[PDB]
Design a binder for this molecule. Structure first.
Ligand SMILES: Nc1ncnc2c1ncn2[C@@H]1O[C@H](COP(=O)(O)O)[C@@H](O)[C@H]1O
Ligand SMILES: [Mg+2]
Ligand SMILES: [Mg+2]
Ligand SMILES: [Mg+2]
Length: 210
């Protein structure tokens, strides 16, 4: 090819973390305005923004080209600053993601998809009473799409684009699973914040800045 991404090293992953955190920060007020579940306290964007900034600050201060070591730095940053339901779940999604790659220097598209799925498994186990129509649902559907696409797609850019398309479809379907979302007329705020991070991931894979 030419401008495709076959492997993601530690600096590329740091770029996805930085641009994902920056895109979430740029949309934090919108994600806040959507927060009606479980308590309508309008803080999901702030909670996820503060959680991801903790991971972002750790990464920016301890860069590595070894993705497994970078992932440890990122994971610890999120886990020691996780705020609210959404930040806790976000830190657990990426705890499982980063644990899956801890011994790797770089990962390919199939390991990337597997890592999204590993994060979903970690997060569902961490939440005592998981509820559908939420950030868990969006993460689960995005991981299912990643795994299906990666078996025939070596380009991590094309994979991330497909992940985003199907995560968007899952997010738009969250009101059909969670009554309060349909009754108020909004998608899930936690899932919207997660999509904001995933869109930053794609920007970084394309060598772009948010
Ligand atoms: N029991 C649960 N299962 C799955 N997701 C949840 C649960 N409780 C809260 N959430 C997510 O957390 C978001 C709100 O986070 P926060 O405003 O930080 O409490 C919701 O929109 C959901 O996506
Ligand atoms: Mg609050
Ligand atoms: Mg809230
Ligand atoms: Mg480019």
């Amino acid at each position: 090819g030419s401008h495709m991404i076959s492997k993601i090293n530690g600096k590329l992953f740091a770029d996805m973390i930085i641009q994902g955190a920056q895109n979430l920060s740029n949309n934090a007020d919108l994600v806040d305005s959507l927060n009606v579940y479980p308590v309508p306290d309008g803080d999901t964007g702030t909670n996820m923004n503060l959680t991801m900034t903790s991971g972002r600050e750790e990464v920016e201060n301890n860069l590595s080209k070894n993705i497994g070591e970078l992932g440890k730095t990122f994971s610890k940053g999120l886990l020691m600053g996780a705020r609210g339901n959404s930040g806790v779940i976000l830190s657990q999604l990426f705890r499982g993601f980063c644990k899956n790659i801890e011994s790797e220097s770089e990962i390919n598209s199939k390991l990337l998809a597997e890592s999204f799925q590993a994060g979903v498994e970690t997060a569902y186990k961490a939440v005592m009473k998981p509820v559908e129509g939420t950030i868990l649902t969006v993460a689960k559907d995005a991981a299912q799409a990643a795994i299906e696409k990666a078996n025939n797609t070596e380009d991590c850019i094309e994979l991330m684009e497909y992940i985003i398309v199907k995560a968007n479809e899952s997010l738009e379907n969250t009101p059909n699973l969670l009554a309060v979302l349909k009754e108020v007329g909004v998608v899930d705020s936690g899932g919207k914040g997660l999509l904001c991070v995933y869109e930053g991931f794609l920007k970084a894979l394309k060598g772009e800045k948010v």
